[PDB]
Amino acid sequence: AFTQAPMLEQNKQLPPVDQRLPEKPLVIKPIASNGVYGGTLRTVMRGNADGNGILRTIGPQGLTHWTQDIQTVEPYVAESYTVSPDAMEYTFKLRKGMKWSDGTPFTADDIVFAMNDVVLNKEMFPQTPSAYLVGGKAPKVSKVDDYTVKFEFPAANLSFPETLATPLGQHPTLYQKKYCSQFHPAYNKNVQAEFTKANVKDWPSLMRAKCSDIELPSRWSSTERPSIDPWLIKEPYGGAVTRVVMERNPFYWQVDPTGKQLPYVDRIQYAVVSDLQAIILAATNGQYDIEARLLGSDVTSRPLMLKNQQKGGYKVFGQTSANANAAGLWLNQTTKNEKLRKYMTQHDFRQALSLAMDRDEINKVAWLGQAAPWQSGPFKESKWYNEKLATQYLKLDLAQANQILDRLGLTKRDSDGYRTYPDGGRVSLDAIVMIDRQAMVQTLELIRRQWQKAGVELVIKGSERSLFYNRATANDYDISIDVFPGGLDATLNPRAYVAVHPLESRMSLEWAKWYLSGGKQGIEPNESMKKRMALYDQFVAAKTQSQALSLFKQILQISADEFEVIGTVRPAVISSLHSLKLQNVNEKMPFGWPYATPSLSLPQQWYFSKLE
């Protein structure tokens, strides 16, 4: 029938392997070769707020999964699904006999519980996760039979299969009804008895503590939360741990073409290292079997990584980043600086700042000449390419920048030669940056010098990640520097074009708060942004592919016309690495959060062999 890992063969307390697998397990075709059981995968997470490093190692186990070339999705946890002709109704067929990590049957009841008792429960989630909303409206989720679940949306939802393949669309498979119902008042009529032991005082917080959510640290901090993951937490993630250990799921629901129950690798061990420089040192000494998340986006480490391949016994593979920009300037339309805000909100002021920038200098110095000047738009390889959004205002034109600033009335000068506002005060912008992002910090220093020639002061406020995010959510910045997504993943990750992401749409997080709260909170966006938000809701509800294309192209055009965020360079190659002994890593996969890379590569079929 099927075969199993020796470490499970030796555990006589488990059911036979046939009884642990679905009747028809998902058969994984390996990337390169059929594999061998065994070993520990060594990798790394940066500190104690990096739980997505586990998620992007083991992979979200969603109803669908990206293909290796990210051009479409395929049924994953679902055996198959159907779509109604108008794309309003999705029906998923599950794999009969599939089981959770604790041996409990996996059935339609779990998906209906996840959606109706957790995701769509307004006490649990006062704002419903956007992955399941069409025009701010929720689907009707119902059990069709013991292995079939139906989603009925109030409008067409063409993108739902793709959404289900992203990390943020994985709630349907995240909650086992039996275990989680213990912590839910619709099932446990004395759930308050669980509060004290869990250090909580309400049931949504109890659910978060015990059952968790996509990106909560609690997802990886307990050994008793059942899952359908390829490996399971054994040594948990915590506030002060130095390592995390996961071991194979004995009920994993996939086999290779020889009938072997996956995964091949027995164990994953994560070093928990706060200092990014210590991670670089360990990685160049070959301490990690895979590192494809933390070190590759900053090209300043690439020379050292390449140089130490032979000594460390690893191979660098270059990935194409989905991001449009490696280090974009997010200008805050709702800056609390009242004098600056009068200019920040003018298109021509933002144009001037872009024209005063020398992106060739930025590329050659901060990015070792390995990147390329770019603004915020999708790449030419994408159907979403917009020439204006990608390339306007890219060339240094200091004279025109100074001419615009003069025309805006910023002609008075202070004793250091900077421009001032008409009623005094240096024209000065505070830029927040994470201090350990070396290329981003260096980019800001070069921009500071360039803007000085236009009489504008850039104040660089570098900090640890936590203070960077606290400054952002306090609306306490004029500029925030971080990537612009959208080079390849524009509709999956539209934060730079329309203010829909509550932490990262930093042209104004108050605008995003207004969008997500239906106008009850936050700050009213300007007319061009409200129009894009309305177009975005129409796009999600588009009845046809060509209507979707038209609507999102309109969003991108308005974004180009407004020029709200200023790019420096599109990404250099992403330098990832894997040990020479680690087999079946797809070295051609793109890099990005919507595909949870490197887990896109199906880590359950990675394996170890030392081969010539």
Ligand X SMILES: O=C(O)[C@H]1O[C@H](O)[C@H](O)[C@@H](O)[C@H]1O
Among 52, 64, 173, 297, binds ligand X (CB under 6 A): 52
- Report the Cα 563 to chain-centroid distance in Å: 24
Q: By C-beta, is 57 or 568 nearer to ligand X?
A: 57
532 binds ligand X, rule: CB under 6 A: no
Q: Give the per-residue contact string, 537-576, with ligand X (x = CB under 6 A; - = no).
A: ----------------------------------------
Binders of ligand X among residues 438 to 477 (CB under 6 A) are: none
Q: Which residues pair with 345 in a beta bridge?
A: none
Omega cis (within 30) before 263: yes
Comparing CB distances to ligand X, the nearer of 492 and 556 is 492
Task: Please give the Cα distance from 3 to 238 (Å, whole number).
Answer: 35
Q: How far is the CB of 506 from ligand X (least distance, A)?
A: 12
Min dist. Cβ of residue 320 to ligand X (A): 17
Q: Which is nearer to ligand X, 35 or 60 (CB)?
A: 60
Least separation, in Å, of the C-beta of 295 and ligand X? Answer: 13
CB of 215 to ligand X, least distance (A): 6
| Measured distance CA(478)–CA(433) in Å, rounded | 11
* 552 contacts 486 by C-beta, under 8 angstroms: no
Q: Are 101 and 251 in contact (CB under 8 A)?
A: yes
DSSP class of residue 605?
G
C-alpha to C-alpha distance for 154 and 136, rounded to whole angstroms: 10
Smallest gap from Cβ 591 to ligand X, in A, equals: 11
In angstroms, what is the minimal distance from the CB of 436 to ligand X? Answer: 14
- Got the DSSP string for 317-355? EEE-B-EEEEEEEEE-TT-S-HHHHHHHT-HHHHHHHHH
CA dihedral 298→304→305→310, nearest 10 degrees, is 170
Nearest distance, CB of residue 53 and ligand X, angstroms: 7
Number of residues that bind ligand X (CB under 6 A): 5
Closest distance of CB 235 from ligand X, Å: 21
DSSP letter for each residue of 244-258: EEEEE-TT--EE-TT
By beta-carbon proximity to ligand X, the closer residue of 215 and 348 is: 215
Using CB atoms, what's the residue nearest to ligand X?
52
Tell the smallest beta-carbon distance from residue 545 to ligand X (Å).
27
C-alpha dihedral sign at 132, 135, 136, 137: negative
Member of 593, 595, 607, 608 binding ligand X (CB under 6 A): 593
288 makes contact with ligand X (CB under 6 A):
no
Q: Residue 134: in which H helix or E strand, if any? A: none
Q: Is 56 in the site for ligand X (CB under 6 A)?
A: yes
Residues between 213 and 252 with contacts to ligand X, criterion CB under 6 A: 215
Measured from the CB atom, the residue of 393 and 515 that comes closer to ligand X is: 515
- 599 lies in the site for ligand X, by CB under 6 A: no
For position 297 contacting ligand X by CB under 6 A, the verdict is no
Chain centre distance of CA 449: 32
The one-letter code for the residue type at 257 is: P
The CB-of-293 to ligand X minimum distance in angstroms stands at 7
DSSP assignments along 278-290, one per residue: HHHHHHHTT--SE
CB 143 within 8 A of CB 79: no
Half-sphere exposure of 387 (CA within 13 A, CB side): 0
- Shortest distance, CB of residue 96 to ligand X, whole angstroms? 33
Kindly provide the b/e burial profile for residues 236-269, where b requires at least 16 CB atoms within 10 angstroms of the residue's own CB.
Answer: bbeeeeeebbbbbbbbbbbbbeeebbbbbbbbbb
Binding residues (CB under 6 A) for ligand X: these are: 52, 56, 215, 504, 593
